[PDB]
Amino acid sequence: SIQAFVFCGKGSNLAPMQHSTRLPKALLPIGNRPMIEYVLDWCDQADFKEISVVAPVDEIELIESGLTSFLNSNHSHHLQDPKKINFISTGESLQKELLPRINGDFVILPCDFVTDIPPQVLVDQFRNRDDNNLAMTIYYKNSLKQQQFFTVYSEILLDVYSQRDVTKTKYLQIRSHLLWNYPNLTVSTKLLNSFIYFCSFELCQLLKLGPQSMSRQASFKDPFTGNQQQQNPPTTIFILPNETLFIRANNLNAYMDANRFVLKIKS
Amino acid sequence: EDRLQAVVLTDSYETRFMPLTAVKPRCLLPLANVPLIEYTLEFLAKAGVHEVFLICSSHANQINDYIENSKWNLPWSPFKITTIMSPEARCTGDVMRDLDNRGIITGDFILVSGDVLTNIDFSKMLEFHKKMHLQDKDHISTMCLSKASTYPKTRTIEPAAFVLDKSTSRCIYYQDLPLPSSREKTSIQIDPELLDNVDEFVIRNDLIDCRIDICTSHVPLIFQENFDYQSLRTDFVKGVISSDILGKHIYAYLTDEYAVRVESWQTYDTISQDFLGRWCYPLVLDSNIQDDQTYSYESRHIYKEKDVVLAQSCKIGKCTAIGSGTKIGEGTKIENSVIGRNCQIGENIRIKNSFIWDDCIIGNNSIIDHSLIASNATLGSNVRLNDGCIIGFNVKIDDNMDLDRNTKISASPQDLDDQTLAVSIVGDKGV
Amino acid sequence: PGISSVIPTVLEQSFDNSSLISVKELLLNKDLIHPSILLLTSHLAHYKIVGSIPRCIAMLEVFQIVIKDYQTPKGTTLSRNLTSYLSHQIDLLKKARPLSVTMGNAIRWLKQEISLIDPSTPDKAAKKDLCEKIGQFAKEKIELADQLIIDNASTQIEESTTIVTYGSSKVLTELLLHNAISLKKNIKVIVVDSRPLFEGRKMAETLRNAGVNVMYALITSLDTIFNDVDYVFLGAHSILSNGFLYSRAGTAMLAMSAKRRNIPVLVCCESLKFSQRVQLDSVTFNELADPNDLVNIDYENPVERRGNKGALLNQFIKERKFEKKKLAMENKPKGNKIGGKKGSEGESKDASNEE
């Protein structure tokens, strides 16, 4: 039932390296070490035998050559390149395509990863607390602005609001039904999602019927609200996401922060 | 640090209690057979007040006479009471300007709206107020808050949502919501002027209002300057936050222990049930504060004063209190209910979750359930009552009378059904 | 293979009869163990609800899942590596939490069933009949037998009565729930609780959810609540050969008071609960747990305080030792309600020979 998924793509946010056909986003040295090495090291620690890797239309054998040569791997990886992806579809269309391969509960983790955290304890929390989703938040730099806002419950630990300030209006707006239930709420500014996602089996029933997901963040975890109307047919446990806070440095790399990760390693 | 003066906001939440406050004042009403003011005064004495101020206008003569009879007119008292007489019925802002014109406020003063019973030690509060005042110069007032009963699903009258700092504990927003009683509004709009100055935003609705304030000498000067502000919470706090004077701060204090302000009837009922229980550890009936009180604790939360008379083969319940000079007849069931001093009770009477104040006579064969009775009022024979049925002063209900849910009875001999005189609108009678 | 030795806190000068250690957070194990076992061991290590009765029911269901998931190898037969795999399960269960008596009778039943079925019948035809038999076995010995205890107690309890209880016993929760709903009596239920586990708190919560007149109390205050009380029900764990009541923590104290204050003690029990191991004092074989559960300062299980206590290893002799399973003295209880209806604890082993 348990299996891990590695999500590979191509970067458009970065300035210089990625535009070349020979070099992909998966194979990039940051601190004299390859990027996908840390993903393989994590999966080896978490104890997973069934790992399947998804790939875009570009780089069909370059990822397969990187997994075989140099890299410790010692695991059977299933690399596939679907043709429905158009870049303008990113990952949700990839998720809707491959669904009969998954037998039970699945873990989604992108290729753009830097990790310095214990892996097994995140898996154990997913297994014990008995819910659909779990996400991780990590602090921004402290050594010598409008970004994004998360809401966290603290006693069971849950997630409610994750929407950014890009298309957000002049005023901060909250709904009453979503506040009256779960009355205590903590809003985070410094804490950021490092793309760690845990998922259950019962997600397979809804992905084939109703296409609603976007960017694997905006309308991925947001369908959870048992509020106001309640109209979408549920799979039978209340649809509820989770969150856990961490101190150590482990975050995403997509923008200008990639140069700061090199400064973090060399110390 | 010593010398502290206090101002008490009375004549503030009148007619919020609908059938009462007709002849006698708001704060005269007993919680546990003892006036609401007495609780507040006990809180003042435990805090360490040297000078007391009171705001009386409506039924002011009865208040002044009660202070004359009080334990604080006597020379040994740590505080002396001086009453402020104002025009009949005015907002809190109008009284603030009146007091600033008179000019008695020195340094740090105290303001309490309504009557609050709490077991929370105030010495800690004063220290943390002073520590935060030494942090920066332009700092104003202090607010008290306590943790709610997990979910406030039964609490509808106080829907106050608070946005607070994790580091400095500064309030950001105040909002009222109709939500569960009236499903109409959902939206709450917040000002984005204080986003990166705070960073650690914490939004909570799970906090109970207290309306107890430690205030600086700035406050009465601001009230006279900005005379548009009528309220002290809804418009004032929000006005202070939203860049009226830049660099000015207001406190929000979190406390784990019990602190609930009285405002409504069903809130009053919960506080009273909390007092009968051992929620307020120091504030218990057996300790006796009014001096005339001679209450003694009995196991299973049963309170009895001295000179309690009871008939044989009678069953008493849980969380009950009975006053002094009280007589009870046979076949009586008293469960989760307060009965006042000098109250004569007939026979075959079943009481559950109800309320009876001082000097009340009840007729034989009557069932009373979750319903309140005021002082010097008599109940007849064959009386059946339901939940939330509040009966006014001196109301004589005659023999054979049935009243349904929420049937409020007037205390003055206006618009609502049932009055003070014999057979109250079951056959047209009443002035 | 597993983690063994190296234990928190002192070895202790007094009381060192049992193991005080074990795996909470999963690190270094065999990659063949069925995850439903791994879930139950992680459950029982920090469990708040279970107390003797429910532990076996879960253990049976987990076994039923394993057999349903079991596919017979082409080389090795059914009775080849199964019993070794089961021995690995029990050893992992032992590492997490010492087993109950009812668990032992289940294992003994299962090992009897392995020997009964010979490797000659087809695989899918075998396991289909096996799980059906286990289901019927669990129906009889637990669910139906429980219902028999219910009705036996129903005749015994008088109309409009006060009952004081202790623990988190499944049989008694259902007993009192039956009294409140089906029979409709004036049952005043008082619940007592200890420090390591808020078992009674959970019971009272569930009784409140039914809508019962519930008082909730502690061991410290008893000579006040008693002076009221009629029948006292105790959550059985195991009754031994002699007729000693091996049960949870604050049980014997209550048993003593009730014997002293006239109206006695009653115990509901299962026919699977009886053992043949015998003892006379609490020291003999105790279910010891780590003082990590006693670190917290009052109120709830997770509070996390910067309090007064914190050190155990570095402190020069500070044994904060608590026990879980105690022994009530023989004479003090009076009634036992089982599969075979009734019988005093003086009789005890009239079920073990009856089988």
Q: Which residues of A touch B191 (CB under 8 A)?
A: 171-172
C-beta separation of C322 from C195 below 8 A: yes
Calculate the alpha carbon distances from B295 to B195, B285, B339 in Å: 54, 6, 13
Place of tokens 């998720």: A95
For chains A and C, CB pairs below 8 A equal 10
Q: Does an H or E element contain B272, and which?
A: helix B265-276
What does the DSSP 8-state code read for residue A28?
-
Subunits adjacent to chain A (3 or more Cβ pairs under 8 Å): B, C
> CB–CB of B22/B392 below 8 Å?
yes
Cβ proximity of A134 and A246 under 8 Å: no
The residue of chain C nearest to residue B300, with distances taken between CA atoms, is C225
* Run of H or E including B127: helix B123-133
Angstrom distance (rounded) from CA B28 to CA B25: 6
Quote the DSSP letter at residue B129: H
d(CA C173, CA C151): 14
Give dist(CA B393, CA B409) in Å, integer: 9
Residue B95 tokens read as: 């009284």
Helices then strands, counting H and E runs in chain B, come out as 8, 29
The H or E element that residue B146 is part of is: strand B141-147
A 212-231 residues inside an 8 A Cβ radius of C: none
Using left for φ > 0, alpha for ψ between -120 and 50, and beta otherwise, residue A39 falls in alpha
Structure tokens at A232: 């979408």
CB atoms within 10 A of CB C63: 20
The CA distances from residue B184 to A158, B177, B178, B204, C96, in Å, are 27, 10, 7, 21, 53
Q: Is beta strand B171-175 parallel, antiparallel or unpaired with respect to B109-113?
A: unpaired
The residue behind tokens 């206008």 is B57
Q: Which parts of B305-402 fold into alpha helices (H)?
A: none
| Partner residues linked to C336 by β-bridges | C267
Closest residue to B188, CB basis, from A145, A151, A173: A173
Q: What angle do CA B185, B191, B197 make, to 5 degrees?
A: 140
Q: Which residues contact B16 (CB under 8 A, 6 or more apart)?
A: B263, B264
Residue C302 tokens, joined: 């997770």
Select the residue of B200, B201, B206 nearest A183 (Cβ to Cβ).
B206
What distance in Å separates the CA atoms of residue B116 and residue B41, rounded to the nearest whole number?
Answer: 10
Q: Are C336 and C345 in contact (CB under 8 A)?
A: yes
* DSSP assignment letter at A232: S
Q: Residues B419-427: contacts with CB within 8 Å, 24+ apart? A: B419/B395, B420/B392, B420/B393, B420/B394, B420/B395, B420/B396, B421/B396, B422/B396, B422/B398, B423/B398, B424/B395, B424/B396, B424/B397, B426/B401
CB atoms within 10 A of CB B148: 17
Residue B265 three-state SS = helix
Go through C296-326 and write b for each residue having 16 or more CB atoms within 10 A of its CB, e for each that does not.
beeeeeeeeeeeeeeebeeeeeeeeeebbbb
Give residue for tokens 């046979």. B330
- Among B148, B153, B192, the residue with its CB nearest the CB of A172 is B192
DSSP state of C179: I
Which of these, C86, C87, C104, C94, lies nearest to C21 by C-alpha position? Answer: C94
Phi, psi angle pair for B321, to nearest 5°: -140, 130
Phi/psi of residue C36, each to 5°?
-65, -30
Helix (H, G, I), strand (E, B) or coil at B367: strand
Q: Assess contact for C258 and C232: CB atoms under 8 A.
A: yes
**At a CB cut-off of 8 Å and minimum separation 6, what does B153 contact?**
A180, B180
How far is C98 from C52, CA to CA, in rounded Å?
11
| CATH class (in words) of the domain with range B5-276 | alpha beta
CB of B76 within 8 Å of a chain A CB? The answer is no
Residues 222-281 of C with CB under 8 A from B: 224-225, 227-228
List the structure tokens of B17: 């209690």
Tell me if B188 and A176 make a contact (CB, 8 A cut-off). Answer: yes
The Cα–Cα gap between C186 and C183 comes to 10
Reduced to 3 states (helix: H, G, I; strand: E, B; else coil), residue A107 is strand
Contact B203 A176 (CB under 8 A): no
Going by DSSP bridges, is the β-strand pair B296-298/B302-304 parallel, antiparallel, or unpaired? antiparallel
Spatial distance between the Cα atoms of C299 and C218, rounded to a whole number of angstroms: 13
* Cα B144 from Cα B207, distance rounded (Å): 10
How long is chain C?
355
Radius of gyration of chain A measured on its C-alpha atoms: 19
Amino acid at A100: P
Sign of CA dihedral C337, C338, C339, C341: negative
Torsions phi, psi for A136 (to 5 deg): -120, 135
Q: Which residues in chain A are contacts of B194 at CB distance < 8 A? A: none
What residue segments make up the domains of chain C, in order of their start? 11-148, 149-355
Task: Say if the Cβ atoms of A120 and C25 lie within 8 Å.
Answer: yes
Flag whether residue B89 sits within 8 Å of chain A, measured between CB atoms. no
Alpha-carbon torsion, ordered A248, A252, A254, A258, to 10 deg? 20
Please tell me the distance from the alpha carbon of residue C188 to that of residue C200, in angstroms, as a whole number: 15
Report the number of secondary-structure helices (H) and strands (E) in chain A: 7, 11
Q: Please give the biggest Cα pair distance in chain B.
A: 71
Within 8 A by CB and 6+ apart from A43, the residues are A4, A6, A51, A75
Q: How far apart are CA C208 and CA C214, in angstroms?
A: 7
Nearest to C199 by CA among C229, C219, C225: C219
Q: Reduced to 3 states, what is the DSSP secondary structure of residue C93?
A: helix
Helix (H, G, I), strand (E, B) or coil at C4: coil
Question: Which residues on neighbouring strands pair with residue C190, listed in sequence order?
Answer: C164, C215
Amino acid sitting at position B33: N
Interface check for A165 against chain C (CB to CB < 8 A): the answer is no
Nearest to A102 by CA among A64, A54, A58, A37: A54
Q: At what angle do helices C170-178 and C199-210 cross, to 10 degrees?
A: 20
User: SS3 for C301?
Assistant: coil
Q: Which residues contact A41 (CB under 8 A, 6 or more apart)?
A: A115
Considering only CA atoms, which of C192, C137, C186, C195 is closest in space to residue C169? C192
The CA distance from B368 to B380, in Å, is 12
Q: In sequence order, what are the residues at sequence separation of 6 or more whose Cβ sits closer than 8 angstroms to the Cβ of residue A8?
A: A24, A25, A26, A53, A54, A55, A56, A59, A63, A110, A111
Q: Looking at CA atoms only, how far is residue B314 from chain A in angstroms? A: 45
Amino acid identity, position A152:
V
Q: How many CB atoms lie within 10 A of CB A174?
A: 18
| Cβ–Cβ below 8 Å for A176 and B189 | no
Q: What spatial distance separates the first Cα and last Cα of chain C, rounded to whole Å?
A: 37
Backbone angles phi, psi at C192, to 5 degrees: -115, 155
Contact B225, B137 (CB under 8 A): no
Question: Residue B154 corresponds to which amino acid?
Answer: T
Whether C131 and C64 have beta carbons less than 8 Å apart is answered as yes
Q: Would you say A17 and A23 are in contact if contact means Cβ atoms under 8 Å apart?
A: yes
A35, with CB counted inside 10 A (0-12, 13-18, 19+), is buried
How far does C259 lie from chain A, in Å, by closest CA? 43
| CA–CA separation, C159 and C262 (whole Å) | 19
Task: Using alpha carbons, list the distances in angstroms from residue B308 to B271, B327, B342.
Answer: 25, 7, 9
Phi-psi region of B48 (alpha: psi -120 to 50; beta: other; left: phi over 0): left
Tokens of B386: 């339901």
One-letter amino acid of A24: P
- A120, A127, A128: residue with CB nearest C27: A120
Starting at the edge strand found earlier in the chain, the sheet holding B367-369 runs: B315-316, B333-335, B350-352, B367-369, B383-384, B401-402
Q: Which subunits have 3 or more CB–CB pairs within 8 Å of chain C? A: A, B
Cα C45 to chain center, whole Å? Answer: 13
Q: Is A229 on the interface with B (CB under 8 A)?
A: no
A219's tokens:
């309308």
- The DSSP element (H or E) to which C162 belongs, if any, is strand C162-166
Angle (CA) B166 B167 B169, round 5°: 70
Interior/surface letters C72-86, b for 16+ CB within 10 angstroms, e for the rest: beeeeebeeebeeeb
* CA–CA separation, B338 and B136 (whole Å): 49
C25 touches chain A (CB under 8 A): yes
Resolution for this experimental structure (Å): 4.2
Task: Using alpha carbons, select from C170, C192, C188 the residue that is nearest to residue C180.
Answer: C188
Side chain identity at C284, as an amino acid letter? T
Give the tokens for residue C279: 């003892």
User: Within 13 A of B9's CA, how many CA atoms are on the CB side?
Assistant: 25
Edge-first strand listing for the sheet containing A150-152: A150-152, A184-188, B201-204, B161-165, B171-175
Tokens of C15: 């009381």
- Distance (Å, whole) CA B71 – CA B76: 9
Give residue B224's Cα distance to chain centre: 28
Q: What residues of chain A lie within 8 A of the CB of C39, using their CB?
A: 127
Q: Is the dihedral of CA C249, C254, C260, C265 positive or negative?
A: negative
For residue A213, with 0-12 CB atoms within 10 Å meaning exposed, 13-18 middle and 19 or more buried, which class applies?
buried
Cβ neighbours, 10 Å, residue A109: 21
Backbone angles phi, psi at C44, to 5 degrees: -65, -20
Alpha carbon distance B86, B58 (integer Å): 9
Q: Computed from CA positions of residues C82, C88, C92, C97, in that sequence, does the dihedral angle turn out positive or negative? A: positive
Q: Do B152 and A183 touch (CB under 8 A)?
A: yes
Question: CB C109: neighbour CB atoms within 10 A?
Answer: 14
* C-alpha distances out from residue B128 to B142, B143, C83, Å: 10, 12, 66
Best mutation site among B166, B184, B188, B196 for testing chain A: the one with the most A CBs within 10 Å? B188
Structure tokens at C320: 């904060």
Bridge partners of C335?
C266
| Residue in B closest to C221 by C-alpha | B299
C8 contacts C312 by C-beta, under 8 angstroms: yes
Rounded-to-integer distance, Cα C90 and Cα C66, Å = 14
- Whole-number Cα distances in Å, C216 to B276, C61, C204: 16, 33, 7
Classify B355 as helix, strand or coil. Answer: strand
Rounded Cα gap, residues B260 and B270, in angstroms? 10
